Amino acid sequence: SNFGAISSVLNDILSRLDPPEAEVQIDRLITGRLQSLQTYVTQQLIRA
Amino acid sequence: EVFNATRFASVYAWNRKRISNCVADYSVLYNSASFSTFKCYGVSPTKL
Secondary structure (H helix, E strand, O other): OOOOOOOOOOHHHHOOOOHHHHHHHHHHHHHHHHHHHHHHHHHHHHHO | OOOOOOOOOOHHHOOOOOOOOOOOOOHHHHOOOOOOOOOOOOOOOOOO
């Protein structure tokens, strides 16, 4: 998922954009991926 | 062949030149300093 990012792939951001924007696109992906892990773990704790 | 073309179109009827099957050096265009404007969106003139 892009989660608002231009691409789901970090290298499609980093190989194209300067840091002032590349970091923005990355924060969008970090938020999404971090939320996914947090959701996953919560669910694992419940079933545990 | 486009940049040093001897003739350009009227803008209402702008021309479209198809560039394919070739090696594209854009650093030679950018750093020629013959251009007053060379604004690349997303990816910088020498990174593309």
